[PDB]
Each structure stands twice: as C-alpha cells, then as structure tokens.
Amino acid sequence: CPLMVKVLDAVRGSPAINVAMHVFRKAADDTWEPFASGKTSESGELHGLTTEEEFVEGIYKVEIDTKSYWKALGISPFHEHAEVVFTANDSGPRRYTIAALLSPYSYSTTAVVTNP
Amino acid sequence: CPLMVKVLDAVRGSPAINVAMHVFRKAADDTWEPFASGKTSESGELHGLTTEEEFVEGIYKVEIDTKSYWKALGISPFHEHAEVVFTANDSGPRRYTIAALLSPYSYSTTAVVTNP
Amino acid sequence: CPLMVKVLDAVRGSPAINVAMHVFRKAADDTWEPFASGKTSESGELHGLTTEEEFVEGIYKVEIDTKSYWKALGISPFHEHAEVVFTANDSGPRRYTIAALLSPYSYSTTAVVTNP
Amino acid sequence: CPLMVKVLDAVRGSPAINVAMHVFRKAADDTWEPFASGKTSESGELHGLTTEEEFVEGIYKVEIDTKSYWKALGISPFHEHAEVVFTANDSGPRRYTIAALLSPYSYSTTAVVTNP
Numbered sequence: 001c002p003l004m005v006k007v008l009d010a011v012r013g014s015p016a017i018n019v020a021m022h023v024f025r026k027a028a029d030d031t032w033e034p035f036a037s038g039k040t041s042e043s044g045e046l047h048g049l050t051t052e053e054e055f056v057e058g059i060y061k062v063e064i065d066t067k068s069y070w071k072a073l074g075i076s077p078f079h080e081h082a083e084v085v086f087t088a089n090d091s092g093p094r095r096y097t098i099a100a101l102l103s104p105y106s107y108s109t110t111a112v113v114t115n116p
Numbered sequence: 117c118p119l120m121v122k123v124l125d126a127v128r129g130s131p132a133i134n135v136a137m138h139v140f141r142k143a144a145d146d147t148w149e150p151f152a153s154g155k156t157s158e159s160g161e162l163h164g165l166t167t168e169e170e171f172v173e174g175i176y177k178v179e180i181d182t183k184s185y186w187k188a189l190g191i192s193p194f195h196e197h198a199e200v201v202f203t204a205n206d207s208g209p210r211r212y213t214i215a216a217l218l219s220p221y222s223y224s225t226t227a228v229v230t231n232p
Numbered sequence: 233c234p235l236m237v238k239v240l241d242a243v244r245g246s247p248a249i250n251v252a253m254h255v256f257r258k259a260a261d262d263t264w265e266p267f268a269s270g271k272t273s274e275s276g277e278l279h280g281l282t283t284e285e286e287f288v289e290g291i292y293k294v295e296i297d298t299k300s301y302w303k304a305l306g307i308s309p310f311h312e313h314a315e316v317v318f319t320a321n322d323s324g325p326r327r328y329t330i331a332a333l334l335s336p337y338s339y340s341t342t343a344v345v346t347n348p
Numbered sequence: 349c350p351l352m353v354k355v356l357d358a359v360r361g362s363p364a365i366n367v368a369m370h371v372f373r374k375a376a377d378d379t380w381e382p383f384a385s386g387k388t389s390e391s392g393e394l395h396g397l398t399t400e401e402e403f404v405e406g407i408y409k410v411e412i413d414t415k416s417y418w419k420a421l422g423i424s425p426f427h428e429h430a431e432v433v434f435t436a437n438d439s440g441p442r443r444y445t446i447a448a449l450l451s452p453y454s455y456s457t458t459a460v461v462t463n464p
C-alpha cells in the first residue's frame with residue numbers, strides 16, 4: 001500500500017465515510033495529470049490508489065471533496081476542498097499515509113511516511 | 117499582559133465567545149491552586165488574567181469549559197474540557213498566548229511564547 | 233478493544249513510539265483514581281487498556297507524557313503532558329479511539345466513538 | 349481589511365515570520381488568475397492583501413509557501429505548500445481571517461468569517 005488516505009470527522013467523532021478524492025501528479029508543463037482516485041470506505045480509509053512500480057518521483061496533489069461531504073450532512077462548509085500537495089518518492093519508494101481531520105470551517109492534515 | 121487565551125470555533129468559523137476558563141498553578145504540595153479565571157470576549161480572547169509580578173515561575177493549567185460551550189449550541193460534545201498544562205517563566209519572564217481551536221469531538225491547542 | 237489510543241508525530245511524520253500514558257477515572261470525591269496505563273507500540277498505538285466489563289460510565293482522563301517524548305528527541309517542548317478528559321459509557325458500552333497529533337508547542341486530539 | 353492571513357509555527361511556538369503566500373481567484377475560464385501576494389510580518393500576519401471593492405464574489409485560493417519556510421530552518425518538510433480554497437462573498441461582503449498552524453509534516457487551517 002504505497003499511498004493510503006484516511007479521513008476523520010471532528011463533528012460526529014467518526015470516520016468520514018464516502019469522501020471522494022482525486023490524486024494528480026504534476027506534469028512537465030506544470031499542469032496536473034490525473035493519477036488515481038476513489039472514495040473512503042466505512043472505516044474512513046482509501047486503499048489501493050496505486051502500486052509501488054507506478055508511484056514514482058513527482059509532486060502529487062490529493063484533492064479531497066470535503067464540500068460535498070458536509071453538504072450531504074446538511075452543513076454549510078468553508079472550503080471548496082482540502083488539498084494536500086507533496087513530493088513523493090524522491091529518495092526512492094516510500095509508503096505514505098495522508099490523514100485529514102475535517103470540521104466545517106477547518107481541516108488538519110498530517111503524513112506518516114515509512115521506508116518499506 | 118503575560119498570559120492571553122484565544123479560542124476559535126471550527127464548526128461556525130467564528131471566535132468562541134463567552135467560553136469560561138479557569139487557570140490553576142501547582143502548589144508546593146503538588147495540588148492545583150486557583151490562579152485566575154475569566155471568559156472570552158466577542159473576539160474569542162481573554163485578556164488581563166494576570167500581571168508580570170503575579171505570574172511567577174511554575175506549572176500552570178488552563179482548563180477551558182468547552183463542554184458548556186457546545187451544549188449551549190445544542191451539541192453534545194466529547195470532552196469535558198480542553199486542558200493546557202505547561203511550565204512558565206522557567207528562564208525568566210515570557211509572554212504566553214494559548215490558542216485553542218474547538219470542534220465537538222476534537223480540539224487543537226498551540227502556544228506562542230515571546231520574550232519581552 | 234473498548235479503549236485505544238493512537239499517537240502521531242508531526243515533526244518526523246511517523247507514529248509516536250514509546251509514548252507513556254496513564255488513564256484515570258474520576259472518583260466520587262472528585263479525585264482521579266488509577267484506571268489503566270501503557271506505552272505506544274511501534275505503530276504509535278496502545279491497545280488492551282481495559283475490557284468491556286471493566287469500562288463503565290465515568291469521567292476518564294488520558295494523561296499522555298508528551299514532555300518525555302520530546303526530551304528523548306532532544307527537543308524542548310511546551311506542554312507538561314497532553315490530557316484528554318471525557319465522559320465514557322454514559323449510554324452503555326461504546327468503543328473509543330483517542331488520537332493525538334504531537335508537535336513541540338502544539339497538540340491536536342480527536343475521538344472516534346463507535347457503537348459495538 | 350476583508351482578507352487577512354495569520355500563520356503560526358508549532359515547532360518553535362512563535363509566529364511564522366516572512367512566510368510568502370500567493371492568492372489566486374478562479375477566472376471565468378476556470379483557470380487560476382493572480383489576485384494578490386505578500387509575506388507575513390513579525391506577528392505572523394499578512395494584512396492589506398485586498399480592498400472591499402476588489403474582493404468580489406468568487407473562488408479564491410491562498411497558497412502558503414511552507415516549504416521555503418521549513419527549508420530555511422534546516423527542516424525538510426513534507427508539503428510543497430499549504431493550500432486554502434474557498435468561495436468568498438457569496439451572500440454579500442464578509443471579512444475573512446485564514447489561519448494556519450504549521451509543522452514539518454502537518455498543517456491545520458481554519459477560517460474566521462465575520463459580517464461587517
């Protein structure tokens with residue numbers, strides 16, 4: 001599991017389920033190329049985004065559709081989405097967990113990076 | 117103003133107004149003695165808790181009554197309070213801003229420490 | 233697993249390993265009775281603190297020794313410890329995950345509460 | 349002052365000083381157009397980015413150059429930048445404070461939205 005995303009809900013004290021996100025990789029012309037995507041499970045986790053061989057050096061952007069999540073709960077949010085932009089695999093493969101904790105007007109994000 | 121506390125509401129995107137808090141200082145017998153108390157203003161800030169002369173070296177605890185805050189908004193929150201425990205003025209007088217960002221099931225707290 | 237604590241390190245991007253903590257339960261005289269304790273594993277997690285039958289209604293305090301964690305890394309921290317105080321099991325058993333994300337001058341904490 | 353950004357350093361317990369950031373606004377063709385830029389002061393705050401007349405309805409992005417900040421302190425951070433994307437002034441003019449709390453592998457961001 002080279003890249004996993006975990007999302008939590010700070011209002012309900014629960015995993016954030018069915019949160020959609022796309023992953024992009026920065027292209028040579030500075031545009032964002034589609035790379036992976038999915039929705040969080042009932043555990044708030046999204047596994048299986050990529051494989052070790054496909055996940056090479058680059059700048060990656062995880063764009064998490066937090067706005068649709070809050071609107072489904074009938075809550076008006078601040079952000080259009082939560083974006084996480086980072087260089088990955090510059091020193092060869094690593095395993096990355098991107099975590100996000102969501103509130104309607106705030107989010108926090110952290111990374112856990114491990115050498116396989 | 118050597119000690120200031122600022123509290124923000126991550127659900128509503130606003131200062132957390134009229135939040136009560138109590139400050140304690142550890143006594144020689146290791147019990148918590150009352151030190152100061154107050155409530156946040158319309159800006160979410162509590163100023164004037166202490167003075168340079170009174171705010172001596174010690175271990176201090178700020179106990180923020182987050183539970184009453186959420187209950188008054190019709191939210192049943194997770195925590196009884198948000199607690200911040202720290203040694204102050206160990207290397208001479210400093211000015212401390214304690215900030216807290218509140219959600220029903222989560223809080224974040226940070227400190228800004230400056231040398232006058 | 234009625235009560236689990238997970239701790240992450242925001243400076244190193246890693247689980248916070250070997251973080252010691254004690255759990256207390258508030259007694260009828262408002263004192264804090266010892267309840268459980270342990271240290272986080274290499275995954276940053278502490279499992280096995282209690283059992284469903286022992287973990288009944290009460291106000292619980294998880295006192296996480298963040299200061300010793302940072303001092304072992306040669307980093308001077310702000311807080312004496314990170315405290316998480318919450319009522320548990322007031323509506324019968326639940327499963328609780330307490331998570332904390334640590335920085336030298338800040339911490340964030342959230343809860344995931346699930347009905348078994 | 350309809351838009352202000354405040355940045356704090358969770359490692360040092362200080363304002364994050366001399367942090368560069370760029371603000372963009374989504375154009376009719378869905379591209380990001382430059383809107384304003386600046387750097388935080390000794391208080392960690394960036395004031396004067398825009399005016400009430402210029403700060404019309406739209407989708408805005410604040411891109412905070414956290415990577416250069418950490419690198420100058422000798423830290424190799426995780427994120428390329430901290431990004432905040434939001435719709436502004438949808439229901440008439442508001443005043444926005446965007447706050448960010450920075451660690452090498454994590455950031456938290458919140459908004460305070462007030463009606464003048």
Ligand SMILES: Nc1c([N+](=O)[O-])ccc(Oc2ccccc2)c1Cl
Pocket residue numbers: 122124215216217224225226338354355356447448449456457458
């Ligand atoms: N994370 C955080 C916390 N915190 O205690 O973690 C407190 C406040 C906060 O926003 C502000 C608000 C005012 C000044 C600086 C930062 C954030 Cl963004």
Ligand SMILES: Nc1c([N+](=O)[O-])ccc(Oc2ccccc2)c1Cl
Pocket residue numbers: 006008099100101108109110222240331332333340341342
């Ligand atoms: N904010 C935060 C907190 N927290 O106690 O606030 C704890 C953990 C965390 O990342 C994770 C990491 C793994 C699983 C769930 C969340 C974040 Cl992002």
Ligand code: NA
Pocket residue numbers: 206207208
């Ligand atoms: Na001293």
Ligand code: NA
Pocket residue numbers: 438439440
């Ligand atoms: Na409108």
